[PDB]
């Protein structure tokens with residue numbers, strides 16, 4: 001598999017985008033990890049280049 005972006009390049013943030021958070025993006029890594037963000041993660045975050053994209 002290929003690499004994801006890093007959190008600041010992916011536009012990670014401090015509170016959710018409506019219904020979308022670190023858990024309702026697409027491929028957040030349960031229970032407490034990601035692939036775009038260096039883990040452990042804030043579930044309230046979200047990013048603009050979330051894992052599970054192309």
Ligand code: SF4
Nearest residue numbers: 022025034046047051
């Ligand atoms: S991949 Fe998902 S859980 Fe991780 S920073 Fe982006 S929105 Fe958050």
